[PDB]
Ligand SMILES: OC[C@@H]1O[C@@H](OC[C@@H]2O[C@@H](OC[C@@H]3O[C@@H](OC[C@@H]4O[C@@H](O)[C@H](O)[C@H]4O)[C@H](O)[C@H]3O)[C@H](O)[C@H]2O)[C@H](O)[C@H]1O
């Protein structure tokens with residue numbers, strides 16, 4: 183009798199997993215029908231923005247924690263606090279506190295007060311290595327606790343870069359990192375950030391930031407421990423990792439199902455190499471599951487959001503289908519200890535959540551345009567056509583203008 187629209191995003195294996203779990207929800211609530219709108223991750227923001235602009239908002243949807251305040255200000259997200267309190271069987275205190283608090287807002291600050299969404303997951307972005315390749319090369323395995331230095335990391339990456347079939351041409355590389363998702367840990371571990379502590383000033387022109395960015399670009403262009411520009415164009419580094427051509431590549435929990443299907447070599451997780459702080463760093467991701475402020479069926483919509491985020495049966499299905507780690511802290515701790523489930527050091531995911539994972543800088547700002555500007559024109563640096571020092575000096579005032587505007591627009595939208 184009652185229809186809900188659920189909008190979300192995912193890689194192919196995520197789409198399959200959530201479609202399955204939505205069917206499980208529909209089996210449990212035979213009166214509720216769920217209509218699915220799903221996109222690829224890169225197409226999502228545009229589609230959701232269009233839907234909000236038209237005020238034709240899906241009943242339940244994924245959203246970016248960095249938009250929480252903006253969404254509250256424009257009355258996009260329903261206050262779901264009472265629906266959550268009033269539903270027996272769920273105790274949000276069993277869920278990662280860092281996850282739940284990203285979607286609390288008390289009228290002035292994020293992290294406390296009323297619930298405007300539920301955490302899809304936490305998404306620690308670990309470093310993986312190809313154990314098969316190491317062992318075939320006779321290189322000592324990485325330590326599971328002690329981070330490589332940047333020099334040590336390049337040194338092993340060079341040893342792994344070789345012509346393995348003796349035809350004259352390199353066919354195996356140390357790594358092939360995507361700056362969009364892996365530059366953060368190098369910047370952070372080098373004691374830098376995109377913005378200052380107050381989150382109001384752009385700081386990409388910090389010598390430590392420049393050093394990190396230049397080191398990143400140098401992996402491809404100077405140290406030559408990656409496929410060439412043209413080789414990455416031919417087949418991207420994610421695909422080359424799947425095919426066993428790369429010694430190191432990141433791993434998120436959402437990758438696990440895809441890796442189960444496609445990766446034939448043995449791989450495991452380690453800390454990221456550490457810069458000047460000697461402490462590894464990476465990001466912990468998250469998406470919120472929100473309910474439309476204008477939903478005609480708030481009780482059921484929240485029941486869907488709860489089934490995906492906190493319900494032990496919905497959660498067990500998602501974890502079983504290998505697209506995320508348990509939202510329940512206890513289930514997660516037990517999961518990590520089970521040696522029948524690989525990677526062997528999946529504990530690293532929890533260490534990231536608990537110890538050395540950070541949030542994306544845009545989670546602290548009212549919108550992310552200032553940060554999108556940094557990446558928009560980054561490619562000449564990565565391709566060795568422009569120095570990191572020259573780019574950040576050019577980008578900084580453009581980023582700063584956009585960040586100032588976000589700060590002002592917050593002031594005007596919250597009145
Ligand atoms: O190209 C290969 C692909 O890229 C790498 O993954 C990067 C992206 O992760 C996938 O999405 C996973 C979701 O994102 C996580 O949150 C990250 C950010 O944190 C918040 O600030 C933002 O809202 C959110 O964007 C979340 O925990 C997780 O569900 C996406 O498909 C990839 O583009 C990997 O190397 C490989 O999968």
Ligand SMILES: [Ca+2]
Pocket residue numbers: 345346347348349350351352353
């Ligand atoms: Ca060869």
